[PDB]
Design a protein around this nucleic acid. Structure first.
Ligand SMILES: [Mg+2]
Ligand SMILES: [Mg+2]
Lengths: 45, 295, 101, 123, 132, 137
RNA sequence: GGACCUGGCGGUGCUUCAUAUCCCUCUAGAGGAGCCUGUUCUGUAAUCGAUAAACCCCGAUCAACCUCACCACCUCUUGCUCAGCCUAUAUACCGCCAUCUUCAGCAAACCCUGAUGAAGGCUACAAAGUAAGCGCAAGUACCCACGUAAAGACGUUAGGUCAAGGUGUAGCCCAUGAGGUGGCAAGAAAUGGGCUACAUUUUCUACCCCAGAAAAACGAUAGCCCUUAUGAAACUUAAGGGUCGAAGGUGGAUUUAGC
C-alpha cells in the first residue's frame, strides 16, 4: 500500500520524528529555484 | 609492544576460563580444540572462508626500550635471512676446513619459516648455498639442517571378507561422470559378472562396454578366475561401464600381488577419472562454444 | 502515491478484478461447458462481455513493486532485476548470494 | 513514492556530478549540508515531544505532548531562517589571506610551521 | 568494470567499514546477510512481503536516527518476533536514544502487527576496517 | 545471598483423556548456514537425550536454486549475473514419544529456533481402529 | 637565438613469439534453399533506445487488449500524490555496465642523485631506492591440489542507458499532464543470427543398440482447412489433426567456434 507508506512517512516528517533527507534535498532545490525566479504557473489562467 | 601482547594473553586466559565455565568443561583440560569447538557451536558462521569465521586464539619488535636491537644483523633489514646465510656459510667453512622424494621448500615456505620477505634472487642464492652444503659431504649435523628445509613429495587396499555362503570376497566402489558403481569380487569364481542381477552380456549389449569390463581382469591375467556382482546407478552405458571397471579393479586389488597393484595403477585402472561435464556459462552456447561473433 | 500512473492503473485493475472475480468466475463457468443449452451460453457470453473491460484478469500486469518496471520482474520477490540486484549485492536479502560453480 | 527515496550523500553525488565525461579531463555548484541546523523532533506541525526536542521534566514534573501555537511556530521558523542566513553569510565570508609579493603571486605567502617530527620533534 | 556495491580506492584516505570494504561476490564468503528470514528458503512463501518490510524498516530506521547509525542494520525474524540490531554512535544523548527506541518499537509493532524489538550497540565512532 | 527463598512451580494438570501416541516425528529444519544447522542439531540432540527421547539424525541432500539476470541496465545481454539460494536440510527423527513429551520438546526447540532456519515437523500419530470399522453396518 | 630535458606516434626491418591463436594444419559450421527472428529500407496517422570490434532472438527470463511510452478521435483540470511530465540534455550525474582485460600494472607516502635546473633513481660475485595500499596472486564456490567460474586495479573510447529508478539544468501547467474507445506491425528489398534439411553413418516401425522394411524417395515448425488449449475477446498466440510434398541435392570470395 504505497499510499499508506508515503502518507505515514510524510506525517512523521511533518511531526519531526522522521528526517526525510530526500525530501529535504528536494525542498532545498525548490527554494533555490524559487529564488532564481522559476515557479509553477497558476492553473487555469 | 610486549606489554600489549601480555595484556592480550591475560585477556585470552580469562576468556578461556569463562568459556570453559559456560560449556561446563574443566577449566584445566580446556584445550585449544575445545575452545574452537565451543566457539563454533556458540557462534555458528557458515562463511566459506574459514579465516572470516569467529575465532578465539592466543609479528614482534626487534629492539628493547633502550633502542638497542637484539640481533647483531638487524640493520641489514633482513636479519633472519642474513643470519641463516651466515650460519650456512660458517657450516660450509667448517666442512671445508675439516676436509628420492624430498625437494627444496618454495620461496613462500622460506618466507614463512623466516617470518620475513625475500626476493627471488635471495631465495636462489640460499638454495644454491644449501645445494653446495649437501654436495660437500656434509655430516648429520648439517644433514638435519638441510632436512629442516626439505619437503616430502601408495593405494590403500580393502581387506578380504566372508559371506553367509562361505565364499571369500572383497568389495569396493567407483564412480565415473554421474554414474556410481559398487562391485563385489569373489576370490574364486568362473568369470561370471552380474550387473544389477543381470548378466553382463545382457546388460551391456555394446561391445566396447564389455571390453572395458574385461580390461582389469585381462590386464592381471585373471579372466575366469573370479565372480563379480555389481550394482551401478546413474549415467549412461559408457559411464556405468567405466564405474564398474574402476570398482572391479579396486576390489581385485585385494587379491593380486602388490606388484600387480602397482602395475594396474600405472595402467590407469585405479585412478578415478575426474573428467566430468563442464557447466554451461552465460553469454555462450555451451561450456566453451561462444556465440557466433557478429561483425 | 504510487511510483507512476502505470502502477496506479495496475492497482485499479487489480482492485476491480478482485471485486468482479466471483461474477466473472460464475459466468465463465456457465460458458466453459458443453452441457448447458447454447442459447444460455450465448447470453452468458454477452453478460461477460457487458462487464467492464478493466475487470478482466488478463489485463493485470506484474510490475515491479518499487520501480513499476513492467518487464524483468522476478515473481517470487516482485522486484525488477535492477532493484533485486541492488538489494542482493548489498546483502539485504537473506540467503541470496552470488552463484559460482 | 517512498521506496524510490535515497540518502543525502547519494543525491549530492548525483547532483554535483563530481565525476563524469566533463570532469574526467576538463573537456558552479557545491555541496551544502541540510542537517547542520536541523534538530531532532522539529516539524512543520510544531509539536513538542517530551524528552526528544523539549526537556522531559518541567517544574520537576513529567511533561506531556504539546503543540506550539501558530504564532510560536512562525517565530520558530523565523529563528531557523535567521540561523540559516547567518550561517550562509559566515560561510560566504572568509578571513582574507595576507598577500605575498603581489596579489596573485605565491611568493612570500606564509605556510605556517612545518609538520611535527615523529620522535617528539616540533618546529 | 563492475560498479555494483564496491568502494573504489582513490587516495587511501576514505574510511570504510567491513561491510562496505567487501564486494558482493564475498557475501557467502566473508560477510553474512544483513537480514535473516526463512522467506528465501526452499518451499517457503512470502519472500516479497519480507523484502518489502525489510526495505521499509531500513529506510525508516535510517531517518528516525539521523546521523546516528554507525553501520547498516541487522534484521532478524524468529517466528513473529522481529529484532532490529543497530550499531549507533554516541553523539546523541541517552534520553533521546531511549525515546527513539520506545517510539520506533511501538510504531513498528503497531504498523507490522508483530512484536518488534530494537537493540542498540553504541560505538564511539564508525569502525574503520581499512582505508581506500 | 539473594537467592529466592522459595520458587513457584508452573501449574501442571493431568487430564483423564488418554494421551496422544506419536510413533515418529520428522523435524526437518531448513537453513542457509551449515554451521547454524549443526549447532541447532547439537542443541536438539542434547535436549532430547536429557529428556530421554530416542532421536536419530541425518542430512538430506542440499538444494541449490540458481537463476540468471542481466548485469547491465540498458543492453548487455551477453553479460549476466548468476544468483543462487542454498537450502541445507537436517532431519531429526524422534521415535516412540508421547503427546505431552512431543508438545513440550517441540515448544522448547521451536522457541529456540534460530533466525533464518525454517522447520517442517511431521508427526506420525498412532490410532486405534474406529468404533464403526470393527464390524459392518 | 644558444644549450639541454621529457618526447612520442613511423602500411620501417631483423630475431623471437602467440596455442583455439596471427597463418596453415583439426572438427563442425555460417556465406546456397526454406522457415524463424532482429535490423535497415519502403510504407503507415502510428513509439523510443541499441548502431565496427564493444548493435543486430539487443533493453524483452518476451507486444492480441493491458503491456504502451505511438497514432486518430473523444473526455478531465489543484488532477492517486503538499500535483504531474516516457518533455530536452548520458556532452551535468548517481546508479548498472561495455571495451582493451584471453591485461599487470596503478600507486600515495618517503629517500637519494643532478651544484637542490625541465629531470633521474638499473647492475644479485649487486652500484639508491623503499614502499603502505589497490589489482594480479592468494583464499573461496563447484568435483581435488586441476579445471571452470567468480574475480580482474588505474586508465581508454566526452563508450551505452535521463525509457529501471533518482537527480542537476532548461521547458510544458485548459497540457509536452491525466482518462477512455479504436488502430499499426506490410513487403520491392538488403542484412545479421537461429532452426530444419538437402539423406544411405539415411528414413519408418519395434526396441532403446544382434531386427524388419523404405530408398527419387529424402525434405516445411511454410501455405490452406479444422479442432483444441488460454482468454471477455484467437483474424493476429500456442498445441494437434487433415491437406499440400514446394525450394533444395553439401553451397563463391570470405567467415565463426572449439585444446
Ligand atoms: Mg589583485
Ligand atoms: Mg507503423
Amino acid at each position: 500500500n504505497h499510499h499508506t507508506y508515503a502518507e505515514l512517512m510524510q506525517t512523521l516528517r511533518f511531526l519531526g520524528l522522521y528526517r526525510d533527507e530526500h525530501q529535504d534535498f528536494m525542498d532545498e532545490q525548490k527554494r533555490l529555484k524559487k529564488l532564481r525566479g522559476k515557479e509553477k504557473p497558476k492553473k487555469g489562467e | 609492544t610486549e606489554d600489549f601482547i601480555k595484556k592480550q594473553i591475560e585477556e585470552f586466559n580469562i576468556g578461556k576460563r569463562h568459556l570453559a565455565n559456560m560449556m561446563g568443561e574443566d577449566p584445566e583440560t580446556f584445550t585449544q580444540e575445545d575452545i574452537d569447538r565451543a566457539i563454533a557451536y556458540l557462534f555458528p558462521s557458515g562463511l566459506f572462508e574459514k579465516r572470516a569465521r569467529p575465532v578465539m586464539k592466543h609479528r614482534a619488535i626487534q629492539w628493547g626500550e633502550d633502542g638497542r636491537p637484539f640481533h647483531y644483523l638487524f640493520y641489514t633489514g633482513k636479519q633472519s635471512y642474513y643470519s641463516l646465510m651466515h650460519d650456512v656459510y660458517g657450516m660450509l667453512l667448517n666442512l671445508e676446513k675439516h676436509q628420492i622424494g624430498s625437494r627444496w621448500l618454495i620461496k613462500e615456505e622460506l618466507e614463512e619459516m623466516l617470518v620475513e620477505k625475500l626476493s627471488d634472487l635471495d631465495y636462489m642464492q640460499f638454495i644454491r648455498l644449501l645445494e653446495k652444503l649437501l654436495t660437500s659431504q656434509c655430516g648429520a649435523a648439517e644433514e638435519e639442517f638441510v632436512q629442516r628445509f626439505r619437503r616430502s613429495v601408495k593405494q590403500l587396499i580393502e581387506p578380504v571378507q566372508y559371506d553367509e555362503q562361505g565364499m571369500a570376497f572383497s568389495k569396493s566402489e567407483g564412480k565415473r561422470k554421474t554414474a556410481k558403481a559398487e562391485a563385489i569380487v569373489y576370490k574364486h569364481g568362473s568369470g561370471r559378472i552380474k550387473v544389477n542381477g543381470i548378466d553382463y552380456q545382457l546388460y551391456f549389449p555394446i561391445t566396447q562396454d564389455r571390453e572395458q569390463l574385461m580390461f582389469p581382469f585381462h590386464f592381471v591375467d585373471r579372466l575366469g578366475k573370479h565372480d563379480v556382482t555389481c550394482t551401478v546407478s546413474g549415467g549412461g552405458r559408457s559411464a556405468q561401464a567405466g564405474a564398474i571397471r574402476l570398482a572391479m579393479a579396486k576390489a581385485l586389488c585385494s587379491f593380486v600381488t602388490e606388484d600387480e597393484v602397482e602395475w594396474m595403477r600405472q595402467a590407469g585402472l585405479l585412478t578415478t577419472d575426474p573428467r566430468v561435464r563442464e557447466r554451461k556459462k552465460p553469454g555462450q552456447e555451451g561450456a566453451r562454444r561462444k556465440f557466433t561473433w557478429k561483425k | 502515491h504510487y511510483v507512476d500512473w502505470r502502477m496506479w492503473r495496475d492497482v485499479k485493475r487489480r482492485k476491480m478484478a478482485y471485486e468482479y472475480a466471483d461474477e466473472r468466475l460464475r459466468i465463465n463457468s456457465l460458458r466453459k461447458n458443453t452441457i448447458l443449452p447454447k442459447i444460455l451460453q450465448d447470453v452468458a457470453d454477452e453478460e461477460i462481455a457487458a462487464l467492464p473491460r478493466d475487470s478482466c484478469p488478463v489485463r493485470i500486469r506484474n510490475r515491479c513493486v518499487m520501480t513499476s518496471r513492467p518487464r524483468g520482474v522476478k515473481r517470487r520477490w516482485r522486484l525488477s532485476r535492477i532493484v533485486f540486484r541492488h538489494l542482493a549485492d548489498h546483502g539485504q536479502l537473506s540467503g541470496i548470494q552470488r552463484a559460482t560453480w | 513514492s517512498f521506496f524510490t527515496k535515497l540518502t543525502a550523500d547519494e543525491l549530492w553525488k548525483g547532483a554535483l556530478a563530481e565525476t563524469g565525461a566533463g570532469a574526467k579531463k576538463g573537456r558552479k555548484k557545491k555541496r551544502k549540508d541540510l542537517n547542520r541546523g536541523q534538530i531532532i523532533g522539529e516539524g512543520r506541525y510544531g509539536f513538542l515531544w517530551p524528552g526528544l526536542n523539549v526537556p522531559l521534566m518541567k517544574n520537576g514534573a513529567v511533561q506531556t505532548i504539546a503543540q506550539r501555537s501558530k504564532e510560536e511556530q512562525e517565530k520558530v521558523e523565523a529563528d531557523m531562517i535567521q540561523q540559516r542566513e547567518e550561517w550562509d553569510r559566515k560561510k560566504k565570508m572568509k578571513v582574507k589571506r595576507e598577500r605575498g609579493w603581489s596579489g596573485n603571486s605565491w611568493g612570500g605567502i606564509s605556510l605556517g610551521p612545518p609538520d611535527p617530527g615523529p620522535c617528539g620533534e616540533t618546529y | 568494470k563492475n560498479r555494483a556495491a564496491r568502494v573504489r580506492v582513490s587516495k587511501g584516505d576514505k574510511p570504510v567499514t567491513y561491510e562496505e570494504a567487501h564486494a558482493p561476490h564475498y557475501i557467502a564468503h566473508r560477510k553474512g546477510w544483513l537480514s535473516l528470514h526463512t522467506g528465501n528458503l526452499d518451499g517457503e512463501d512470502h519472500a516479497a512481503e519480507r523484502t518489502v518490510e525489510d526495505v521499509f524498516l531500513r529506510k525508516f530506521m535510517w531517518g528516525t536516527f539521523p546521523g546516528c547509525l554507525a553501520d547498516q542494520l541487522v534484521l532478524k525474524r524468529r517466528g513473529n518476533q522481529l529484532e532490529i540490531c543497530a550499531v549507533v554512535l554516541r553523539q546523541l544523548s541517552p534520553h533521546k536514544y531511549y525515546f527513539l527506541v520506545g517510539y520506533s518499537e511501538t510504531l513498528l509493532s503497531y504498523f507490522y502487527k508483530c512484536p518488534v524489538r530494537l537493540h542498540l550497540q553504541t560505538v564511539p565512532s564508525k569502525v574503520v576496517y581499512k582505508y581506500l | 545471598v539473594d537467592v529466592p527463598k522459595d520458587l513457584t512451580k508452573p501449574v501442571v494438570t493431568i487430564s483423564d483423556e488418554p494421551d496422544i501416541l506419536y510413533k515418529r516425528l520428522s523435524v526437518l529444519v531448513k537453513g542457509h548456514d551449515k554451521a547454524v544447522l549443526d549447532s541447532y542439531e547439537y542443541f536438539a540432540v542434547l535436549a532430547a537425550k536429557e529428556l530421554g527421547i530416542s532421536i536419530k539424525v541425518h542430512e538430506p541432500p542440499r538444494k541449490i536454486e540458481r537463476f540468471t539476470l542481466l548485469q547491465s541496465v540498458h543492453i548487455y545481454k551477453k553479460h549476466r549475473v548468476q544468483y543462487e539460494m542454498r537450502t541445507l536440510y537436517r532431519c531429526l527423527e524422534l521415535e516412540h514419544l508421547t503427546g505431552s513429551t512431543a508438545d513440550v520438546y517441540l515448544e522448547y526447540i521451536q522457541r529456540n529456533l534460530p533466525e533464518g532456519v525454517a522447520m517442517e515437523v511431521t508427526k506420525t500419530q498412532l490410532e486405534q481402529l474406529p468404533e464403526h470399522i470393527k464390524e459392518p453396518i
